[PDB]
Amino acid sequence: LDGDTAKAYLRARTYAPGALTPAPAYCGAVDSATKMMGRLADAEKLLVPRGWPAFATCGIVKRLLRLAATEQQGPTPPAIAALIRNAAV
Amino acid sequence: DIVWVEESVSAITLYAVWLPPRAREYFHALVYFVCRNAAGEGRARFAEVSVTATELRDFYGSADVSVQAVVAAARAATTPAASPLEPLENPTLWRALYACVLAALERQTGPVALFAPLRIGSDPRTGLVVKVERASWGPPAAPRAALLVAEANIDIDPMALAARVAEHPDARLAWARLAAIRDTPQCASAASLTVNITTGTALFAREYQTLAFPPIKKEGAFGDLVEVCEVGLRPRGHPQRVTARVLLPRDYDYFVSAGEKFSAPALVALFRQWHTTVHAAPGALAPVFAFLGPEFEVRGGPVPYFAVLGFPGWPTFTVPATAESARDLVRGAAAAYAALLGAWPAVGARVVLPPRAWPGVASAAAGCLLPAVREAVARWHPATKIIQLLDPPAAVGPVWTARFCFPGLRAQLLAALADLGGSGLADPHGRTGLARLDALVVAAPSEPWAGAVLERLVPDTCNACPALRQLLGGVMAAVCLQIEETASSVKFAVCGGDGGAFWGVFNVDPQDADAASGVIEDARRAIETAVGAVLRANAVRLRHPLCLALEGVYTHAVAWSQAGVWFWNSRDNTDHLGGFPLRGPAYTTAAGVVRDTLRRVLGLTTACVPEEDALTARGLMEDACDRLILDAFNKRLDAEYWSVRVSPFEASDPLPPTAFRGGALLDAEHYWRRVVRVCPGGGESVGVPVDLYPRPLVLPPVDCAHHLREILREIELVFTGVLAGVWGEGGKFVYPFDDKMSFLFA
Numbered sequence: 001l002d003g004d005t006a007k008a009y010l011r012a013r014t015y016a017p018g019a020l021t022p023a024p025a026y027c028g029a030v031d032s033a034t035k036m037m038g039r040l041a042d043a044e045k046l047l048v049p050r051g052w053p054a055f056a057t058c059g060i061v062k063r064l065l066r067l068a069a070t071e072q073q074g075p076t077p078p079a080i081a082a083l084i085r086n087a088a089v
Numbered sequence: 090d091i092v093w094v095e096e097s098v099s100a101i102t103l104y105a106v107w108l109p110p111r112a113r114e115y116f117h118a119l120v121y122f123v124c125r126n127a128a129g130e131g132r133a134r135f136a137e138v139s140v141t142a143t144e145l146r147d148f149y150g151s152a153d154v155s156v157q158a159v160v161a162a163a164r165a166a167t168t169p170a171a172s173p174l175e176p177l178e179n180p181t182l183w184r185a186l187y188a189c190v191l192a193a194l195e196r197q198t199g200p201v202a203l204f205a206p207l208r209i210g211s212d213p214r215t216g217l218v219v220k221v222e223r224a225s226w227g228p229p230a231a232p233r234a235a236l237l238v239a240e241a242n243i244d245i246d247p248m249a250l251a252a253r254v255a256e257h258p259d260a261r262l263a264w265a266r267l268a269a270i271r272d273t274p275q276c277a278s279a280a281s282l283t284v285n286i287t288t289g290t291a292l293f294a295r296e297y298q299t300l301a302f303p304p305i306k307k308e309g310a311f312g313d314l315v316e317v318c319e320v321g322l323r324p325r326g327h328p329q330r331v332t333a334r335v336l337l338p339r340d341y342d343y344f345v346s347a348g349e350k351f352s353a354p355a356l357v358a359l360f361r362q363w364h365t366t367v368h369a370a371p372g373a374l375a376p377v378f379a380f381l382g383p384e385f386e387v388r389g390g391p392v393p394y395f396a397v398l399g400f401p402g403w404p405t406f407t408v409p410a411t412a413e414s415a416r417d418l419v420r421g422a423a424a425a426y427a428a429l430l431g432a433w434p435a436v437g438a439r440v441v442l443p444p445r446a447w448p449g450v451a452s453a454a455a456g457c458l459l460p461a462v463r464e465a466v467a468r469w470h471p472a473t474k475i476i477q478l479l480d481p482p483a484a485v486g487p488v489w490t491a492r493f494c495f496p497g498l499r500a501q502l503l504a505a506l507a508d509l510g511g512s513g514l515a516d517p518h519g520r521t522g523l524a525r526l527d528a529l530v531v532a533a534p535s536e537p538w539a540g541a542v543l544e545r546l547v548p549d550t551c552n553a554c555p556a557l558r559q560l561l562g563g564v565m566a567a568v569c570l571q572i573e574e575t576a577s578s579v580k581f582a583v584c585g586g587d588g589g590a591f592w593g594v595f596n597v598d599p600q601d602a603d604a605a606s607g608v609i610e611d612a613r614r615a616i617e618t619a620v621g622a623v624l625r626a627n628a629v630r631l632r633h634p635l636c637l638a639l640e641g642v643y644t645h646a647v648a649w650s651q652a653g654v655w656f657w658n659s660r661d662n663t664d665h666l667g668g669f670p671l672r673g674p675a676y677t678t679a680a681g682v683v684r685d686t687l688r689r690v691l692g693l694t695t696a697c698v699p700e701e702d703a704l705t706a707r708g709l710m711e712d713a714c715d716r717l718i719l720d721a722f723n724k725r726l727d728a729e730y731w732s733v734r735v736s737p738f739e740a741s742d743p744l745p746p747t748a749f750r751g752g753a754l755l756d757a758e759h760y761w762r763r764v765v766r767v768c769p770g771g772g773e774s775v776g777v778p779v780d781l782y783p784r785p786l787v788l789p790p791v792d793c794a795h796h797l798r799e800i801l802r803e804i805e806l807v808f809t810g811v812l813a814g815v816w817g818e819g820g821k822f823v824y825p826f827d828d829k830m831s832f833l834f835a
Contacts, residue, residue, distance in 0.1 A: 005719055009833070012725075048747050051777055051788040053769050062770050066789060073726050079787050 012071055029083045033057050040064065043082040052079070091219055092211045096124035096132065097229045098203055098221075099342045101431065102402035103190060104135070104333060104376045106163035108156065109326035114142040116156050117326040118190045121335055121376075121402050122218060124209060125342070129230045133318045133337050134209065136218035137325065138193035148185040148192070150444035150553070159186055166399065169361040169378040174271040176398070177264075180385050187398055188439035191430055195521050204232050204427040215323040232423055233289065235314075235341035237405065240753060241282035241300075241355040245269045247749040254744060259737050261389035261762075262748075262755040262781065263353065270354055277358045284359055286314060290340045300362050314340065317367060332373040336363070336401045343426070345419055348393045348409030352756040353384045356395065356405065364400050376400045381435045383759040388737045391760055392545060396435035404431055421538030428532075429525050433542060438553040441507070441522045441546070442514075447554035450510025454560060457509045457628045466563030473562075476569050479584045479648060484814035486645030486691070489595040489605055490584075490656060492665070493613065494638045495620075497533050498589035500543040502564050503550065503557070504530050505629035527632045534633065564629065565589065568620050575619040579612035585648055592646065592654065599644070602660070613637045641665060645691050649810020655687050664688060670803065673763075674730045679717065679800045683807055686713040690811065703816045710808045714801065714824040721797055722833050728788055731796050732779050734761040742766075742776030751781040768792040768835075793834040801826055 001009055011017075031039055040063055048054055055063060070079040077087045100123040108116050118138045125131040145159065146152045162182055166175035176183040194201060199221040201207070206224040211217060249272070250265045270277050278301050285294040294308035316337040321330055346356070357380060368375045377399030383390030393407045406422035408415060425433055432440045442450065455466055479485070495501075504526050511520055529546070533539045551558045565588045572591060573583045580596040597608055617637040624631065641663065643656035653668025664687075669680045690706050697705075724730050735741045742764055749755070763779045769789040777788060801824055808822040 001719065005722055008723055012722075047787060049750070049783070051767075051782050051786045053745060053767075053775050053777075053789070054747070055770065066770050070790060071726060073785070076785055076787075079789075 027084065027086055027089070033060055036060060036064070039083060040067075043067075046082050047079065092213060094124075094126070094132075094209050094211070095206070095224065095227060096126045096134075096209050097206055097227075098201060098209075099123045099125055099131075099232065099338075100203070100397075100402055100404050101191070101194065101201065102376075102397060103187065103379065103399050104335075105374055106160060106186070106190075106377065107326055108160045112326075114156055115139055116160055117324060118193070119322070119324065119333075120190065120194055121333075122209075123338065123342075123402055125230060127227060127230065129233070131316075131337055131339060133320060133335050134211070134218050135216075135320060135322055135333065136194065136198050138190055138197055139325075140189045140193050144189050144192070144443075145185060147443040147445045148188040148439055149181060150185075154179075154182055154185065158182065162186075163377060166377045166379050167375045169364045169400075170274070172271075173274055173277065173357060173361045173378055174267060174380075176379050176381050177267060177271050177385055180381060183379055183381060183398060184436055185439065187396075187432060188436045188443070191432055191436070192443075192519065192522070196516070196518055200521065201430065202427070203430060204423070205229065215325075216321055217324070232427075233340070233342045234345050234419070234423075235286050235288045235343075237344045237346045237356075238285045239282065239346070239352070239355045239359055240350070241280040241352065241358055242752060243270065243276055243280045243354055243358065245276060247746075249273075250749040250755070251746060254749070257387050259741065260387045261384070261737060261760070262744075262751075262758045263384035264387055264389070265749075266354055266755050267357075267384055270357070277354070277361055280358055282355060282358055282362075286341075286344070288314070288341050300358060301365075311363075311366075314338065319373065333376075334367060334373045335376075336367060336403075338401075338403050342403075343423070344403055344405035345422075346395070346405055346407050348407040350753070350757060351393065351395070351407045351409075352753055353380070353382050353395060354756060355753070356380075360401060376402075384756065389759045390434075392434050392541070393759060394434045398435070421536075421541075424536065424538045425542055428528055428539075429542070434545065438546065438550040439522075441526050441550060444553040446514065446519075447550070448556060449513050450507055451554055451556045451560050453510035453513030454506040458564075459627050462563055462567045462627055465566050466560050469559045469562045469566065473566070475566060476573050476583055478586075481648060481650055482810060482813050482818065484645075484647035484811065485584060485594055486647075486815075487599045487659070487694070488644070489597055489599060489609070490592065490643045490646045491581075491595065491609055491612075492590070492592040492640045492643070492656065493616070494590040494640050496636065496638055497530060497540070497543060498565065498568070499561060500526075500533070500547050501530050501631045501633065501635075502561055502629065503547055505624070505631055506557075506560055506564065508630070509628060531632050534636075562588075564624075564627065567623060567627065571619050571623040572616055575616050576612075579615045580608060581612045581616065584646070585654060587652070590640075592656070594646075605642075609639065609642060613639060647687070647691075647811050647814050649807055649814065653807065653810065655684070655807075655811070657688060657691060659692075662688070669807065673733050675721075675796065675800060676803075678720070679804060682713055682717045683804060686710055686808075687811060691815070699816050703812065703820060706812060706816065707820065707822060710812070710822055711824060714804065714826075715830065717804075718797060718826070718830045718833065721793060725791060725793055725834065728765045728767070728777070728786060728791050729763075729779055731791050731793065732763045732765045733796070735764055736761065742778075744778065745775070748778045748781040751783070754781055754783070766792045766795045768794075790834075794831065797834070798826060 037060055067080045072078045081089050102121045104119040104121045106118045120136045122134040124134050142156050165172050201221050206227045206229050208222045208224040210219045212219050249269050253265050253268050254260050279299045281298055283296045291309050291313045295304045296306035298305055316339045318335050318337050320333050379398035381396035382394055393409050395405050395407050397404055404426055408418045411418045429440045507523050529539045529543050576583050582594045584593045586592055621635045643658040645657045648654045655666045657664040664684055666684050690709055764776045765779050766774050766776050767789045768774050774792045805822050812820045812822050
């Protein structure tokens with residue numbers, strides 16, 4: 001895959017450039033399986049109104065991985081921004 | 090001693106539908122004429138008709154409908170506060186009702202014509218129109234218009250929509266909303282409706298938080314638009330003096346609403362509020378609150394429209410998008426209104442003839458034809474194609490090919506057969522609906538507005554009378570027979586087509602072009618003349634003289650399925666592809682890729698053994714698939730681009746319980762449901778109705794491992810057709826998507 005598609009495949013399938021660069025503080029969602037289960041549902045309550053289907057410790061990891069993988073569409077804040085609660089994510 | 094005036098009727102609406110005393114099987118209907126004299130000055134007029142039960146059952150097509158049912162529906166529609174949205178119970182009932190009242194208006198009173206000069210009379214002793222006559226003096230005033238924008242947040246409870254959609258599965262979601270308002274009219278009392286009617290004289294804007302409550306923002310007044318008129322009437326049905334309030338539309342004539350986000354519930358609610366406001370004071374009769382549109386039926390409809398069967402009496406035209414040519418579609422809607430008396434597209438196929446008088450005309454047309462076509466009609470089975478064509482796996486070239494079409498052959502043939510059965514009609518005056526179809530056919534080449542009418546009036550008429558299909562397809566079969574007979578004389582060779590449109594080849598040397606034009610033109614002349622001669626011999630006479638269209642000259646032509654044909658003229662590099670489904674925005678890019686791959690693969694006419702060409706063709710086809718899937722990645726996040734338009738007939742994905750929450754977005758869904766298959770979590774692929782969610786959308790990554798598979802499926806169909814049609818057969822072009830380039834998405 002040569003051209004702009006190489007750059008596309010890189011960002012689309014690799015951790016964002018500024019995600020593994022030493023930063024002064026952390027920024028993300030850290031909680032036990034029980035709490036993060038509730039927070040994932042709460043994030044979906046603000047995510048369902050615009051397209052995300054409802055998902056009525058493996059389910060939690062699958063849902064978190066799917067949220068993390070979802071890519072940024074232009075300048076719009078990404079899908080995981082509902083859980084992480086920042087627009088710089 | 091009858092009064093006489095000079096006016097043009099701008100609209101015809103239904104005020105009252107009553108059952109007089111000592112009556113059992115005939116009901117009277119009062120019609121409101123919005124007449125305007127010269128220089129635009131408008132005086133309101135009224136007429137009465139008398140429709141019998143037999144006529145109702147004729148325009149309905151069945152005897153299930155009765156006079157009592159119609160009068161009960163009209164009485165229910167008398168009050169919009171108690172129950173609006175009356176047509177939603179039996180839409181066919183109101184459709185037939187408008188059809189018969191217009192027919193009786195034409196019969197008893199006389200010939201009527203919107204936006205046209207008309208000498209009108211009246212009887213003061215009773216006070217209604219008595220006779221309408223076509224006039225021949227006056228440059229009638231231009232049909233002025235007013236631009237209307239209306240948006241309302243009718244807080245419909247989602248669960249009711251879900252339940253009503255569960256009762257009838259493939260219910261277009263606008264019908265679900267509309268049924269929700271019908272079952273709970275109080276929901277139409279509370280809505281943040283905003284209205285802005287701009288005219289050429291004065292603007293008018295209102296804003297509401299609750300509809301019944303006084304406005305939270307005013308502009309102009311109701312009186313600037315409307316001139317409320319109280320008119321006394323003495324119908325034959327009502328001996329006592331009956332007074333009617335009407336909303337005379339001063340300044341404007343009809344409404345122009347954008348069809349982009351048109352909400353039939355919005356206009357229904359606004360007009361219900363106006364109805365309540367105007368007819369709040371008693372001492373006068375109340376009109377009919379009836380509206381029809383594609384949103385009023387479970388399965389929906391192709392063409393957006395908003396009928397005004399009663400209150401307020403002003404036609405409202407929805408012109409969907411088309412911003413570049415907005416004036417063109419506004420003029421087309423105005424012409425469609427004026428010609429077909431405003432019944433179209435609400436009344437349906439009954440504009441021409443009652444749905445049940447057709448079984449007689451078709452039989453009366455099977456008799457006046459020639460003896461051969463008489464049987465040819467009777468032996469028509471769906472898709473017979475009794476003509477020498479090409480095997481669907483085949484291709485031709487380099488030979489001089491040409492495509493031909495008769496513009497509007499089904500409509501013209503239907504008109505001629507309707508005239509053949511015209512003598513068989515009960516009423517000679519009941520043939521005026523047979524004058525609108527000739528007006529449509531005559532004006533079809535001149536103006537495209539008649540076109541879209543004829544491409545829907547004809548197929549729907551063929552559904553109203555199933556027996557008309559076997560007649561039309563027999564006449565067209567006869568036309569194709571003489572096309573084939575005349576083809577041999579002019580070196581033309583029938584190779585494929587679908588009747589009115591047919592493509593063929595020429596037995597001329599495939600290098601000379603100076604004489605090519607001559608033969609291509611002589612073939613057109615001879616085929617047109619011979620088909621016209623057969624039609625004349627079959628007694629069928631066309632109003633607009635028949636014309637054959639040279640829709641392109643090409644050198645190579647390849648066909649794979651019955652409808653899939655690709656033509657290419659190497660000299661000018663002009664091509665044409667048909668049979669590839671355009672079921673979304675990605676299918677257009679696929680079609681372009683196919684039309685470039687085929688242009689490159691038939692450019693391989695370099696002298697080679699046929700075996701070599703098959704491989705150097707398959708390689709290029711695989712490379713084209715590669716370049717398509719590579720570009721697919723750069724648009725993987727455009728869900729609207731990876732969207733498919735599912736029809737209300739096709740099997741559809743099940744509606745997510747959150748798509749029932751679109752608010753003023755569920756109303757846009759009339760015909761098509763645009764679905765994108767996304768892949769949440771893993772393994773499971775779920776469908777998202779794209780146009781039922783607010784924008785910008787947030788979704789899990791689009792399952793391109795499903796849409797690209799279907800796009801590729803049809804690409805391999807075309808490529809297997811061309812590979813097995815130009816060179817030796819035996820090769821089913823398959824692209825290993827699951828292995829070569831599956832990783833990109835899944």
